């Protein structure tokens, strides 16, 4: 079992690590159709999405992504600084598997 | 995929933006029977609802709009401020599709 | 489709419009067998209650049952002025069907 | 339909009422198997649980059992004064069965 | 039924207690697959796991298990002081049984 966000990245293929040591600036969520959006944005422009459980999750995944939409907007209403995000680099936004909150 | 919410607004149906940049007015909920519904104001008169789900979208589709419920109110409760939301046209009040916060 | 709550309430036969303009005063819960409920109270000495969910409710009537009794203890918690309450007045304590909360 | 917790305590066999007018001192819980349980204190001393789900319980009871453990966490974290609790005494700890939270 | 933390810590083999009253130094959660779990740390260094849902886990566990992870959410947000954590050292991150909340 890894021990921090970094570890649990390099798990895994087309992901990487960005360290962004800031609050979220924005927070966008949609009810609409199949891919009902959760988008996150960084003051320095970075831009993330959740992505919806689909075709491509196993069934553990289910509450987890519903957990980290909500970790998201608590956040973000909270002006918590997000650490780091663990992200699925081969879709656009970058998609978030893992979020850690430091300081 | 769209990356923020204008651009995800302009991918529906009978659709638009509409720019509040202010915090929630008033807020409403309602247990009544098949009335399950939640109502928003702005103080510049604006009114929004989450519509009632009905029987016939999808179990995802409703866990999205149980969210959007979730969202206003904690939205409304903590002041934040709403930036944009994208509304369905043919409802009136006008139904709610996306929210973004941001100050 | 009502806009406000005093239009909603009065699709209804047996429902009345109390208007509290004020905080709630207190806030009660049970998970006694037959008695899952809430009642909350106001300085002026009114009561209210959330009916216990039983086999008569469908499902998004007792989902709606439960995120009342969230917006109720979250209400409570941070102060938020209720308007008004939508009752049903043949029960004792009179049994909400709506909320409106505002400033 | 009782419209307080000394009310509603009166209608059941082996409970009580304390009455702490005192925010919860320490909040407690568990996901040990056979443990999943929850237990607060009072600057008194006074010990209290939210019991473990079992045959004791009828099936509406398990929501409000979750439901009273999100309450008292949330008192506990928001320092709210608890008024009173209604108990079963024939178990130690006492085992909360309804609270009311007031100034 | 134990009365506190440290004795229910004591029914289990392979568990220990830590006194940290301190608040959380960090928060990560992760939905990938197979790693649906979360990680803190404290400013004294220790680092803890709620674990993946796995074949050691009773079904009444599944509930507790993503309760403890709310829990552990909104302790970090709100700097809430944690007086002691029940753990099984059998794992690395030590994995959380119990959790105690105190000044
Ligand atoms: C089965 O035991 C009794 C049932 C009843 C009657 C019905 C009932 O529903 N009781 C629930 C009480 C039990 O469940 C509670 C949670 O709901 C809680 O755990 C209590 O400690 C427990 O005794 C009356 C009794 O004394 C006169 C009993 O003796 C202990
Ligand atoms: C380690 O295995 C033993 C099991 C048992 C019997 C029950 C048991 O261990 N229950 C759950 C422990 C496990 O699940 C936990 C989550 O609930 C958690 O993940 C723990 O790390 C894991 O060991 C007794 C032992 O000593 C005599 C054991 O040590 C060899």
């Given at each position: 079992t890894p021990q921090n966000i970094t570890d649990l990245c390099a798990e895994y293929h087309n992901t990487q690590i960005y360290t962004l040591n800031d609050?979220?600036?924005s927070?966008?969520?949609?009810?609409a159709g199949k891919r009902e959006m959760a988008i996150i944005?960084?003051?320095n422009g970075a831009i993330f999405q959740?992505?919806?459980?689909?075709?491509?999750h196993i069934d553990?995944?289910?509450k987890a992504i519903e957990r980290m939409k909500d970790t998201l907007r608590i956040?973000?209403?909270?002006?918590?600084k997000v650490?780091?995000?663990?992200?699925w680099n081969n879709?656009?936004?970058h998609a978030i598997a893992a979020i850690s909150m430091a300081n």
């Amino acid at each position: 079992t890894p021990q921090n966000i970094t570890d649990l990245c390099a798990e895994y293929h087309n992901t990487q690590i960005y360290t962004l040591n800031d609050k979220i600036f924005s927070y966008t969520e949609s009810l609409a159709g199949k891919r009902e959006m959760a988008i996150i944005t960084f003051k320095n422009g970075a831009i993330f999405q959740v992505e919806v459980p689909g075709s491509q999750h196993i069934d553990s995944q289910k509450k987890a992504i519903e957990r980290m939409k909500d970790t998201l907007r608590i956040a973000y209403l909270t002006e918590a600084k997000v650490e780091k995000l663990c992200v699925w680099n081969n879709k656009t936004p970058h998609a978030i598997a893992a979020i850690s909150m430091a300081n």
